[PDB]
Amino acid sequence: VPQELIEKIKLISPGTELRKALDDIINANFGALIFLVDDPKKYEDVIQGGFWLDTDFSAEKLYELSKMDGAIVLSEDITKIYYANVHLVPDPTIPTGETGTRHRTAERLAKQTGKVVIAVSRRRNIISLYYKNYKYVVNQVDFLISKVTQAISTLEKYKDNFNKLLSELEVLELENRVTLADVVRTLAKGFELLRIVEEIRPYIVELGEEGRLARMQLRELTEDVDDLLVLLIMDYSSEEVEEETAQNILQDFITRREPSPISISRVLGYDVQQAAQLDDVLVSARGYRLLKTVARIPLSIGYNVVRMFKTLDQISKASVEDLKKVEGIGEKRARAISESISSLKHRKT
Amino acid sequence: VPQELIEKIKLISPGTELRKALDDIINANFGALIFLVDDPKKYEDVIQGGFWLDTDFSAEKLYELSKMDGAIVLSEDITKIYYANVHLVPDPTIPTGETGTRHRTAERLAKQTGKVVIAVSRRRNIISLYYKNYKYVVNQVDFLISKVTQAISTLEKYKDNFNKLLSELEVLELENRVTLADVVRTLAKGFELLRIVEEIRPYIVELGEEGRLARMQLRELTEDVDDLLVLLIMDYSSEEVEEETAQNILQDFITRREPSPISISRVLGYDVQQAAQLDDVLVSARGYRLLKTVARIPLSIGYNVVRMFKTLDQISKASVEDLKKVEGIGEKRARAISESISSLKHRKT
Amino acid sequence: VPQELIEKIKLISPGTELRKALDDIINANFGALIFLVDDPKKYEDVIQGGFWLDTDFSAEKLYELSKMDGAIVLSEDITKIYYANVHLVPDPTIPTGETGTRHRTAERLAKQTGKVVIAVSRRRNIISLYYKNYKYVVNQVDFLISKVTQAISTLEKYKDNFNKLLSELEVLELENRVTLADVVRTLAKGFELLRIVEEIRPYIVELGEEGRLARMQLRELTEDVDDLLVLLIMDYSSEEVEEETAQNILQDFITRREPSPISISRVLGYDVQQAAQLDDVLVSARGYRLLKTVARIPLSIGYNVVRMFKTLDQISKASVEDLKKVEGIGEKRARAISESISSLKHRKT
Amino acid sequence: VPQELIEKIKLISPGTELRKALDDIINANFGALIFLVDDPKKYEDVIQGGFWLDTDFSAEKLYELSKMDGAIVLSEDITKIYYANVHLVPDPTIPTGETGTRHRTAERLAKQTGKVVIAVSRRRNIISLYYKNYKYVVNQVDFLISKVTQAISTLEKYKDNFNKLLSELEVLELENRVTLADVVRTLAKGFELLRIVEEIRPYIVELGEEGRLARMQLRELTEDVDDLLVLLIMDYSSEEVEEETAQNILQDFITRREPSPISISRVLGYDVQQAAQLDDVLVSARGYRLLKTVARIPLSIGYNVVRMFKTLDQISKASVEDLKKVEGIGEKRARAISESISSLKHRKT
């Protein structure tokens, strides 16, 4: 979806006075055909009859004006109503996939002038916005909220299973008993979960001001999930990987590639064929996840800790003194690393 | 529900252009009577008047055509509109349980020709599909989603209680303090939960593309429940049972038999009369559940481990060396079995 | 709500063909006035004009007949339609709180004959049923489900807080560190929760077949709550109390008395004035809750265990041999009591 | 929102007979213009034509009367209907931001007389109440419940993350390993959560009797959150702070100030610049939270315990005897403090 169109869709999103007028118009079953232009003069060839108003815009004015036949012409910044009751006459030979005079006129005019044309028919409750060669159907809030509420419920279920996987993985990691299967399973669930977020995103945007609660919920449910997945990648990839690369792995599995077990283990640098092999590959966390998330050591510095001790297993054996030999690790960091890992082992394993 | 009919129901499921036209028709309160035929020629006896169109199908075309009285005739693959405004005249002596000319005509024609006939009346918002001697009422998406959302909430509650039962059962199993009552109680909840899934299934299918989120939720909620229940059967049945048999027990209690305590304990091979006796029967898990789910040992091989040690109690006492004497158990499997069971005991009991 | 009326309300509950016809009638905005009689003959004085049909009942027939003015007369068992289009003429001097001829006629006739009279007006979507001097407004399913879904959500929140209270109480009980405040707080939440169930009950019934999922949810959420609360009463009441009495305490606090802290502590036999005193009263569980729920010892026998050891504190110190000296406690029960309590202490405290 | 207006809004809230009549009027699409006056005589200048009724008020009467053009005049206590079908004639030169004669008349009359004027138009389903220079749009219950149900779901998510933060903070506190970042993070989530409650409040009120379940849910979800946050403030502020001050911090961050990390750490008395510094500031709880919430020691007395031992760290080391040296700490309190803290350490750390 071109950003160019996104900017236009904002014009008729829940919250704006324009959308306010359009909803009223839908409820009254009157029709509407609105043409957004910067300078009316250069468009007089496609504007016939009607009335010249050149007055300030308001939702009430638009609604009343729409009781008459024909089209209304507004300024692109929706601050002025220039015409009402006019006949829009774009070139009839322009191709159109629309049905019914109102929408065919809207599409051709948008294509012809490169300007925005809004159509609202009587036999339906949806807003169609035409911009250049683009068409965007705007749904009603009730419909959007229904889909979004279901997507959120679906997310809660994925998050729950994700929390359960990560919790079990934590036990295994602390006991150094992890297998590639445990990692991939956890990654897959995470990838699939963030995929849902990406898919519902266009719905949230379309909700405008009425999607505020929905955004808040998505934020609380997927808070640190992305950071967590990256750290998992940095910790279990076959060979060392920088954060930025882990992020590319994440973005890739969120949109491009499908999060299938074999496919994830492959990108992680493991040469596997059948998913049955995953339960046989033993792996050891490097310790980034725990270092950054629990010991609160900046990644930049964790790099030094990992380069020296290699794995979480070794770091958990290190002493306060042993850890200070690391560049960037003082008394506080050293104690923080040692104590937080020891605390976790005593509680979770 | 014959699969034969299921194939026809797909034709008018949410997502198809046909359903798109039918919804529009419902919203406009126009009526509709659609007859699906392969070759119009051999049906000219039941097709009177109207107009010959022989044009490409589209939802907009169907909607417009439906503004006229009579019926529309389409190709079975919904790619062609052959007739519009015709009078369908099946044999009037054919029995019909329908009311009102439109539905009586549809049922008799479907019965007469063995073809699909779709009826949509003005005084209601539902689609009736007739195929041979079958009738399928298609509900609106709003209604379906309402029932499905309630069924999902109901499932969440059953799953929660199931998780609680399984969690307590786990403690008991690790402490070798299980009674038949603990097993049956856990099985019953599991059986009842999967029963809900089976019952809501026809609703999910009827939802078509709009049931995608619902499917995802059902999948996250009942993920490994079936495998888990089978393993429970394999572990607590009075006498050894092969997986395939455990599965038959599952399928049976999901559809045929009622998951009553006594009834489950009976099928498991225990001769009980009153539910009060269940709290008195001590039982010991064979160890399949833990072997497959936690130690990740293939069932095929677990069979060997169980045939040698008999119960989880004995396996938990076995040593790495003792376990390797089993056919198919190497150093890795042996360590995996021993360590995962020891880890669980230290954490859960 | 008299059971007598409940039986009549079933006649028009979701699921019945009668309600099916009434919903259709509501959607069409036609009106309806239905009079249910056993023998039409003895009511000819209040039945004028119309048509004698004496035909078999069906929803389609009722719906069609309702397109005409006047009333319809059916058999009490809803198997026969005796009249259609008649004028019902009860005594006009009979008092009525209704407005509009249709409802005034219905109420007076029901009062006059002691029979059921159903009225459905055009300017609204609700069914009014009149039986003798009773009036029952039947709501639409959509409305009912909305209230019921909210009540269920509200219940989930109370159950969660209840689980948290009971969980903390469990720690305290095992450590013999309980105070009257911990008990009352847990009881109050339980009482309030079951109060919600009682209040939503009339809604579930009114839902008929469409309240099946709602019932299942209420059952999963409040499963053993009543038994649990009774045992809590038996365990913390100032002086010994029999189960049956504990139950009266429960029923009382669910309907009659308000579950205020002081009020609960008072009924439990503690003479307190200000809620501040509750945190100062130390109490010890007798052990019924744990004996019945965890050790699975029948109450009848727990009575003997409590009469001998007095408190959970003492039972937890008892030996297998010490416990067998109790009448009804064998080797199994004795082991069950001892091991389950010891297991709990090792895990929760 | 002036309380003065709140009192008027109650007049038309769900539950009242007046609102009952207004809903019926909305469903019928009749219009309504109601003027509430104490003494009709002194308003005869703005009341023209119509009918003098001087009869008792009822919803049915109001609904029927509204079928006629013009306005209805009721007594301020909604117990009397004085006029029906009248022409209200306020001064036309009074400014009005309304459109359409009905609303312009209502606003001007309310402004002119300082009395309540209720307007309901045909082309919409909302009630507009005018009082003096105020205007309050009353929404339908369906709309309100939709927003409120979403706000509750959003709250559940914030509460869950809050519980997780507080749970981890608890471990850290018991191990005396807390950093300013852990405290602020927990406070921020708490502050944001209570902010949602404040924002949805006007919706709950507008729901009237239909907002009962919603209130119950908000109460169960945010129960002790405020007390908990205050205690957190009292425990981690840079320098000692009295409860009343902690409360001002809470109220401030709930409405005025934005709960940004730096902003919270600043108000707590810590001079920080970049959020990165928070992970470096070690802090120790004074012990109020644990003393009041777990040991059940009144704040008034906790003040003495803290003034003597200073931190939770020191209190956890204190002996029963050491604690009794505190003014207000007896054998019970002393044991309660010592045992509850020791119990927590053994279970959570």
UniProtKB/Swiss-Prot annotation, chains A, B, C, D:
Q: What is known of its domains?
A: Consists of three domains: an N-terminal globular domain with diadenylate-cyclase (DAC) activity, a central helical domain and a C-terminal DNA-binding domain.
One Pfam family, short name please?
Answer: HHH
Paste the cofactor note: Crystallized with Mn(2+) to trap in the pre-reaction state.
Superkingdom classification of source: Bacteria
Task: Give the protein's cofactors.
Answer: Mg(2+)
Its ancestry begins with: Bacteria, Thermotogati, Thermotogota, Thermotogae, Thermotogales
Protein name listed in UniProt? DNA integrity scanning protein DisA
Q: Which family does it belong to?
A: Belongs to the DisA family.
The residues listed in the UniProt record as binding 3',3'-c-di-AMP, with positions renumbered to this chain, are 70, 88, 101, 105, 122
The DAC domain covers 2-142
Native organism: Thermotoga maritima (strain ATCC 43589 / DSM 3109 / JCM 10099 / NBRC 100826 / MSB8)
Q: Which gene encodes it?
A: disA
Which BP terms from GO are recorded? Answer: DNA repair
Modes of activity regulation: Inhibited by 3'-dATP.
Kindly state the subunit structure of this protein: Homooctamer.
Instruction: Kindly indicate whether the keyword Iron belongs to this entry.
Output: no
Give the Enzyme Commission number. Answer: 2.7.7.85
- Keywords linked to the UniProt accession: ATP-binding, DNA damage, DNA repair, DNA-binding, Magnesium, Nucleotide-binding, Nucleotidyltransferase, Transferase
Record field: catalytic activity: 2 ATP = 3',3'-c-di-AMP + 2 diphosphate
